[PDB]
Amino acid sequence: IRLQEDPDPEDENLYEKNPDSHGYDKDPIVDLWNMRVVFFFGFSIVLVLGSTFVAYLPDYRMQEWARREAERLVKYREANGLPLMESNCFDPNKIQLPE
Amino acid sequence: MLKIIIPTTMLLPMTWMSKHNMIWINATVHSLLISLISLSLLNQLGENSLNFSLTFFSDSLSAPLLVLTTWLLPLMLMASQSHLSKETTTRKKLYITMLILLQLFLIMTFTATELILFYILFEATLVPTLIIITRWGNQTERLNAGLYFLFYTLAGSLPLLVALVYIQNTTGSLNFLIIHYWSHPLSNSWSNIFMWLACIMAFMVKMPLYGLHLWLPKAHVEAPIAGSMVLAAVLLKLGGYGMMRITTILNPLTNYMAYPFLMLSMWGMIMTSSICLRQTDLKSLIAYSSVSHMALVIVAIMIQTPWSFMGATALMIAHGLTSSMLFCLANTNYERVHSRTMILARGLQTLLPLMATWWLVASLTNLALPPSINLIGELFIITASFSWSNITIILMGMNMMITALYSLYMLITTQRGKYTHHINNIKPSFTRENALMALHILPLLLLTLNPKMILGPLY
Amino acid sequence: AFSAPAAYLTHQQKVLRLYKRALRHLESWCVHRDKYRYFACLMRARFDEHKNEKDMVKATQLLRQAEEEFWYGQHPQPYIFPESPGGTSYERYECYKVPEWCLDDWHPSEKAMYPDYFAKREQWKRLRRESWEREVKQLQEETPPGGPRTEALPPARKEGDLPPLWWHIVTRPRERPM
Amino acid sequence: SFPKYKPSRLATLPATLDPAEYDISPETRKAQAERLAIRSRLKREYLLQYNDPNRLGVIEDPALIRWTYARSANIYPNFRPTPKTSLLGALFGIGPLFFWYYVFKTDRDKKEKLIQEGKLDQTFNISY
Amino acid sequence: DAPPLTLEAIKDRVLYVLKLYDKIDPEKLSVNSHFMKDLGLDSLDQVEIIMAMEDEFGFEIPDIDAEKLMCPQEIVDYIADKKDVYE
Amino acid sequence: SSLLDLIWLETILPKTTSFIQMKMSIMVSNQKGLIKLYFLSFLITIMISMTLFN
Amino acid sequence: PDSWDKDVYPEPPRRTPAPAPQTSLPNPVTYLTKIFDLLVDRPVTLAREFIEQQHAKNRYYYYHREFRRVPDITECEEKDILCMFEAEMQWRRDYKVDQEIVNIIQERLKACQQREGESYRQNCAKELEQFTQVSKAFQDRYSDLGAHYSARKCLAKQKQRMLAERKAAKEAAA
Amino acid sequence: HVTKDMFPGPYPKTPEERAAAAKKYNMRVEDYEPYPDDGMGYGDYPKLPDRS
Amino acid sequence: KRLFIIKPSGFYDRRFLKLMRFYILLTGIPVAIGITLVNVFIGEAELADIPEGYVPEHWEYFKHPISRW
Ligand SMILES: CCCCCCCCCCCCCCCCCC(=O)OC[C@H](COP(=O)([O-])OCC(O)COP(=O)([O-])OC[C@@H](COC(=O)CCCCCCCCCCCCCCCCC)OC(=O)CCCCCCCCCCCCCCCCC)OC(=O)CCCCCCCCCCCCCCCCC
Ligand SMILES: *P(=O)(O)OCC(C)(C)[C@H](O)C(=O)NCCC(=O)NCCSC(=O)CCCCCCCCCCCCC
């Protein structure tokens, strides 16, 4: 031997001392409460409440507003015979081309 | 963003003042609460971003990454508490402090509004990761892995710093809004070519790009479980976010300078999938799968079309979740048998059924299985690449075939077959491990249910 | 499977294995029982014709020619018993085989569901633990100084002893475990 | 006589057709005995460890450890730049890259020429 | 599904096949009769007997183990051990 | 895996750089600590600075 | 139904042929339709009536947000950040509205194809022309702007198109 | 438990090195044969028959 | 004759599944009941023109009651 080294320790099994162990801590009470807080907070709170919050987030992307505006524009344009989509985004009168 | 930044800086003293047996409980509970608070950033506008103040802003691209980071912190806490049972109280608190500092730096990086602050923070993320790897790694190669990771990132990113200060001197501002509104075309000159190279190469090394990726297998194999989870889930997404941010000022030079990177990305995607086909180590297989997916993201960003950006963002989120779940499963297998060899342990389906179910789900999400967000992102990228050119479909099909091949090869080798006779220390799966897998997999399916939240600003 | 192999196969063993393989492939060719009986009698007639030969070189040459003829004339799809390695029912129940070490990790309630079985299991475990030292002593006493020259194991030479290395052979899972 | 069987790498030669299987030197018998002795010694060691009742865990396999180490961590120290390795590396690493570059560049040049000449069917192409 | 085998059933079936063998005299055939020492057979006859037993019971006996079965009782014991029959 | 990832991608960027830095480090640090030698070096530097810089 | 506008979402008048049986055999389809109406339609109608009665007791309203027009990028001066911001926001809103217009036209096309069925190639030629015109205009507007599109890029593209048209007209007149 | 002497090493160039390598891999000296030293990184790992 | 079937411990997997179901349904069921009650009684808003001189709020610009809240 070249050192005064400890031998490699044996692997410790949590089920030996605590057959109904959740694998969080060696202490049974702390292990049980760690399982309880993780499950409750994570699953219940985060998953369920965040999912319903995201589901019912207000339509700030203006999808339905854009649909209503498009409906009004289509109705007005096809009622008056105008093209449904104007070929230019900006006004050629307001655009000044070089000579 | 202060309502999310300050709770992390309060996580730090809480962890350092908590009892010796309550550190994990307190950290997990309050990390979950912070994630729930950060879920409120997903309410974005369709016109512009959320400008909180002069320093921080949130966008449709920044919000999913912030939510992913905040959700990822407690999972890393669970895995770390798995593998650090015998550590001393001070060292446990130091590990939790490193994780908290990494999360804080990542949040500030994603919310930063200037390119220089973004650079400072995304370089500051190196120190906690390097310390974690080189201090709590298991094998000898952790030191070499840390050196490779550090020097690859820094050699990539220093020219980015020089180019950023040059751009500020030239134009007047590094603010993202100003450089977006006041953008001017980048003429075809050698100086512009080298500026483009500096920025793109920094973020490509961060991606990583094929040929500049060996640090990724070295670090991911040799890092502890928390380091492996954070490195693949989030730290690989800094390059993609940066490239999606800086490409505003690099046009139209990107049309001419993207060919070598596109060829590298496609061919290296094929090559890394082939490498996955012949891997004797599970963590290495997962690492090279990560490289292939990030190469696909690089292709999407380089082709740079509105359909490619949405696919890139969706694929980044999906890959983060999937790679984190795969690393967790491999870590449980390793803790069972104390070795990373793939063929050492077999029959884990007849020895551990629920873990076999988790493996099946993770491998199904790893390959593009509809209607998962993985498939959504991959399909958008494939469509954009098809519009770009019509042989990219050949390359993408080859990659998909090899991806399915190696994913199912890993699943069959680890789970199916007959159990190894001499391995009799495989105890039943823990409630902690099962909860970890469930919390990895359920958000992915919920994001599949609601997909517009991870498609970025181009949606 | 249960018998330790030798260093080599003798000429008699080689010719007997060739005979059995040829008969099996002939039965594969000759589907009907009477036709198979006729041609199997002819095959054994050939073997009996060449049974008596004093020249071992000529016998080896005949064996080589017979092996080449068999390889040319073999059935591409020979009949295989369902449980044989090539069979359609091979390794079907390997997923249902669970070991006793996996059995002992049960919860106390699960163990209490089978009270009588686990008492006998504990008796078997005590019997195993009370014999290992004698087994290893017997194994190390009877081995040659150079090392084991074959995979055969000795039996129990004493009234109160068990054959060395018996636990897994005795407690291997049943062929139809579930 | 009967047509001969030609073994290949993907269809190996059966043992019963191997010419060396019927020409046994006395040294071949002692070589087989030595192989059997090695196998028996390894089997004895493994069986002792396997049937030990006080053992809990995995019987570490030195052969498996050597295989895993040689496959990954032992490649570079034993690599030398030779003409064969240099040519193979250059080919397999660079040739595909330039091949794909040429293919994609040619396709995009043809497409751009068609666009400029205005004879490419791009109607209804709204998404890109 | 199939009814379980028993030691008596296995012994009866193997003796049935052996008595149906022509080269064996049924009267002098017992469960301990050696095929070559006191029945007067040879290697090919033993191989044919093993093949007949394989056809009878629907499973294959490997050549390494088949050569050592020189007794009807040995065949019964081998079949019972392989089929996990204890009664 | 072997030829590209473990051999040539290692040789080109990270291994060659480390080798060059190690060689240069050995060359720079291989000094015998002789005042005569590095004062003659100072003299050469002075001459070069005087002549080649104007 | 009054939920949508019949002009925006046209439907041709529905001509259902009258039943003219030619056999004494009972109609299983008629019998099953009567059973379905008795067992499902009446309960769901009663439930919906109860729900709508509950709704009418707490009737409240929501409005459609109105945006006024602002000066556009053509009027904005160079590097005038506030005017550029306003013009860019207005341009993005107009882009969203145009996308929804294209969506409406596509829905019309799909509905007409399904309704006509086996005679779609002839009876849907009217909706195909409108879709062709709308797609052409939308492509000319926002065809190749890229991921970082902006009102400035759209204006530059329009200027290029106008210059090309002027050059073509001059060449034709020459 | 494996020592540094039980790991694969460089290509064996002398009969003593080849004998040591054969002993290391639990093989006979006559049956041990390394891959040709072409610089491909095999080292002293034995070349076993290409069967399955 | 009934033979003992050797199986891996399923108690822990059953316990995890039961706990996960219980904690998901602990808040899922009240949320579902609340959503159903809101939809049945406090129905969605009806689109109306803005009265002249009236300035609504953003929640008054949104439709679903939960989104407005
Ligand atoms: C452990 C392993 C597993 C882990 C899983 C992963 C973890 C999951 C964590 C949780 C994730 C949650 C994510 C967020 C969800 C939030 C909820 C949400 O998004 O709701 C959206 C939305 C709800 O609507 P909304 O947007 O709130 O309101 C819009 C309307 O204004 C509303 O309409 P309305 O106001 O006119 O009336 C509707 C009202 C009232 O409805 C009625 O009244 C309907 C009446 C029907 C029968 C009527 C006729 C019969 C009458 C018989 C009696 C007649 C005589 C008496 C009559 C009365 C007295 C006169 O009903 C409702 O509002 C209830 C809707 C359902 C609520 C679900 C809440 C989920 C909360 C999240 C947690 C869930 C945890 C799981 C446990 C859940 C609980 C077990 O839709 C749904 O909830 C889904 C409805 C689906 C209906 C059927 C659709 C067709 C199905 C077949 C399709 C083709 C085949 C496909 C395959 C088969 C199907 C899969
Ligand atoms: P028991 O110990 O009595 O066994 C007697 C033996 C055979 C061992 C003798 O003692 C013995 O060794 N005799 C001399 C060696 C000898 O028998 N040589 C010749 C045997 S091979 C041969 O002559 C018969 C081969 C002919 C048939 C070949 C079958 C190939 C056709 C198969 C086609 C597949 C479908 C039908």
Q: What is the DSSP string of B40-87?
A: GGG---SSS-EE-SSSBEE-TTHHHHHHHHHHHHHHHHHHHHHH-SSS
Residues of E in contact with C1 (CB under 8 A): 62, 64-65
Q: How far apart are CA C32 and CA C21, in angstroms?
A: 18
The rounded distance, in Å, linking the Cα atoms of B146 and B151 is 9
Taking the mean position of all CA atoms in its chain, how far away is CA C138? 25
CA–chain centroid gap for C136, Å, is 25
Three-state secondary structure call for residue G15: coil
Which of H27-51 are b and which e, b meaning 16 or more Cβ less than 10 Å from the residue's Cβ? beeeebebeebebbbbbbbbeeeee
- Alpha carbons G159 and G168: distance in angstroms, whole number: 14
What does the block give as tokens for A85? 């989509």
Q: Which of H8, H42, H50 sits opposite D66 (nearest CB)?
A: H8
User: Ligand 1 centre and the CA of G51: distance in Å?
Assistant: 15
User: Does residue G152 belong to the interface with chain A, where contact is any CB pair within 8 Å?
Assistant: no
- Token pair 């709704």 in the structure block, residue: G55
Please tell me the number of the ligand nearest to residue I40's CA.
1
Q: Which residue has the tokens 């609601």?
A: B450
Q: How far apart are CA B38 and CA B2, in angstroms?
A: 11
The CA-CA-CA angle for residues B23, I17, B418, to 5°, reads: 100
| Residues pairing with B86 in the sheet | none
Per-residue tokens: I31: 């949320």
- Interface residue D122 vs chain C (CB under 8 A): no
Quote the CA–CA distance of D85 and C177 in Å, as a whole number. Answer: 54
Chain G residue with CA closest to A95: the answer is G74
| Pairing state between β B57-58 and B50-51 | antiparallel
Tokens representing B231? 């490195």
Residue B210 CA to residue B270 CA, distance in Å, equals 10
Measured from the alpha carbon of residue G45, the closest ligand is 1
**A70: nearest CB among G65, G97, G151:** G97
Helix axes B23-38, A28-37, angle to 10 degrees: 0
Q: Residue C131: CB partners within 8 Å, gap ≥ 6? A: C161, C162
Residue B203 and residue B242 in contact, taking contact as beta carbons nearer than 8 Å:
yes
With contact defined as beta carbons under 8 Å apart, do B58 and B44 qualify?
A: yes
| C-beta of residue A97 within 8 angstroms of C-beta of residue G163 | yes
Q: What is the resolution of this structure in A?
A: 3.1
Is F5 touching D (CB cutoff 8 A)? no
Token pair for D128: 């890109």
Place of tokens 């999606």: B244
Exposure of B267 by Cβ count < 10 A (0-12 exposed, 13-18 middle, 19+ buried)? buried
Annotated catalytic residue: which of E12, E25, E38, E42? E42
Q: Is F54 exposed, middle or buried (0-12, 13-18, 19+ CB in 10 A)?
A: exposed
Location of structure tokens 């947000």: G65
Q: Give me the numbers of helices (H) and strands (E) for chain F, helices first please.
A: 3, 0
Q: Test E60 with C47 for CB contact under 8 angstroms.
A: no
Q: Quick check: helix, strand or coil at residue I3?
A: coil
Atom 15 in ligand 2: residue holding the nearest Cα: C59
Tell if the CB–CB gap between A19 and C105 is shorter than 8 Å: no
Q: Tokens for B162? A: 């020089």
Q: Is the CB of C103 under 6 A from ligand 2?
A: no
CA-wise closest residue to H44 among H2, H3, H13, H1: H13
CA atoms of B260 and B211, how far apart (whole Å): 12
The answer to whether H21 and H10 have CB atoms below 8 angstroms apart is: no
Q: Residue whose CA is closest, atom 24 of ligand 1? A: I39
For residue H35, the 8-state DSSP code is: P
Closest C-alpha among B379, B248, B386 to residue B311: B379
Chain breaks in chain F (C to N over 2.5 A) after: none
How far apart are alpha carbons B455 and C19 in whole angstroms?
71
Residue C167: CB within 6 Å of ligand 2? no
CA B428 from centre of chain: 30
- Across the interface, whether the CB atoms of I16 and B352 are under 8 A apart is answered no
Joined tokens for residue C149: 């020259």
Which among B235, B232, B226 is positioned nearest to B92, based on CA atoms? B226
Residue I25 CA, closest ligand 1 atom number: 77
User: H or E stretch including I46?
Assistant: strand I46-47
Q: Which residues contact A77 (CB under 8 A, 6 or more apart)?
A: A83, A84
Both tokens of A74, joined, read 């289509």
Question: Reduced to 3 DSSP states, what percent helix, strand and coil does chain A have, rounded to the nearest 5?
Answer: 50, 0, 50
**I1 has a chain C CB within 8 A of its CB:** no
Helix (H, G, I), strand (E, B) or coil at D79: strand
Dihedral pair phi/psi, residue B114, rounded to 5°: -110, 150
DSSP string of B231-251, one letter each residue: IIIIITHHHHHHHHHHTTSST
Give the nearest partner residue to I9 out of C106, C174, C177, using CB atoms: C106
Asked if B271's CB is within 8 angstroms of F4's CB, the reply is: yes
Phi then psi for residue H28, to 5 deg, are: -75, 150
Contact D128 B341 (CB under 8 A): no
Rg of the Cα trace of chain I? Answer: 25
Q: Please, which residues bridge with residue B56 across strands?
A: B112
Question: What gap in Å lies between CA G166 and CA G171, rounded to an integer?
Answer: 9
Gap from F16 CA to chain D (nearest CA, Å): 13
3-state secondary structure of B341: strand
Structure determination method = cryo-EM
Q: Is E1 a catalytic residue?
A: no
Distance CA I69, CA I59 (A): 7
CA distance B254 to B197: 10
| In contact, B214 and F10? CB cutoff 8 Å | yes
Both tokens assigned to D64: 């498996």
Q: Note whether C102 contacts A: Cβ–Cβ < 8 A.
A: no
Give I20→chain B minimum CA distance, Å.
8
Only one residue has tokens 């390794």, namely C91
Mutate to test the pocket of ligand 1, among B358, B442, B452 (most ligand atoms within 8 A of CB): B442
CA of A51 to the centre of ligand 1 (A): 15
**Ligand 2, atom 28: nearest CA belongs to which residue?**
C66
Tokens of D93: 């690493």
Write out the H or E segment, with its range, that includes residue D31.
helix D26-51
Chain breaks in chain E (C to N over 2.5 A) after: none
Q: Which two structure tokens, joined as six digits, stand for I6?
A: 């050797």
Q: How far is the CA of G54 from the centre of ligand 1 (A)?
A: 18
Count how many Cα atoms sit within 13 Å of the Cα of residue B161 in the half-sphere of its side chain. 12
Pocket mutation for ligand 2, best pick of C10, C11, C12, C15 (most atoms within 8 Å of C-beta): C15
Q: CB G62 to CB I50 under 8 A?
A: no
From the list B50, B37, B39, B42, the residue with the least C-alpha distance to B10 is B37
Is B45 in contact with A60 (CB distance < 8 Å)? yes
Q: Are the C-beta atoms of G112 and G127 separated by less than 8 Å?
A: yes
Please give the Cα distance from B362 to D14 (Å, whole number): 42
Q: What do you get for the CA distance between the two ends of chain F, in Å?
A: 56
Question: Which residues pair with residue B341 across a beta bridge?
Answer: B281
Taking a C-beta distance cutoff of 8 angstroms, is the pair H40, H8 a contact? Answer: no
- What residues contact residue D18 under an 8 Å CB cut-off, 6+ apart? none
SS3 H46: strand
Cα distance between residue C31 and residue C29, in whole Å: 6
Q: How far apart are CA F38 and CA F49, in angstroms?
A: 16
Q: Longest Cα pair distance anywhere in chain F, in angstroms?
A: 56
Cα C130 from Cα D79, distance rounded (Å): 54
Residue B208 preceded by cis peptide, ω within 30: yes
Which helix (H) or strand (E) segment is G62 a member of? strand G61-62
Q: Which residue of I has its CA nearest to A47?
A: I24
Closest ligand relative to G43 C-alpha: 1
